[PDB]
């Protein structure tokens, strides 16, 4: 499923962390639109 997480704080924080603890996920970035987390 794909959901949208609007970045609240810093950008790379929600970027760098999210790949580490969740490599089984993909974040589709929408420039200034936030994120589009999808996967399992």
């Amino acid at each position: 499923i794909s959901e949208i997480y609007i970045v609240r704080g810093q950008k790379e924080s929600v970027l760098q962390f999210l790949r580490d603890s969740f490599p089984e996920l993909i974040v589709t970035d929408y420039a200034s639109g936030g994120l589009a987390i999808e996967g399992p």
């Binding site: 794909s2 949208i4 609007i6 929408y30 200034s32 639109g33 936030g34 589009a36």
Partner: protein
């Protein structure tokens, strides 16, 4: 039929109308002040006279 719904929700964020820089001025009413408050609340009904 699904990518549209996802595009619209996204599109609201990326597309916003230009904002209006609300300015402040202080008026020193000459005459009554209750009547010139009611005037500015019928004329120009979005001025925020405090």
């Amino acid at each position: 039929r699904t990518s549209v719904n996802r595009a619209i929700i996204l599109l609201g964020q990326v597309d916003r109308a230009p904002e209006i820089p609300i300015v402040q001025r202080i008026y020193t009413v000459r005459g009554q002040a209750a009547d010139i408050t009611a005037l500015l609340a019928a004329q120009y009904p979005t001025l925020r006279v405090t």
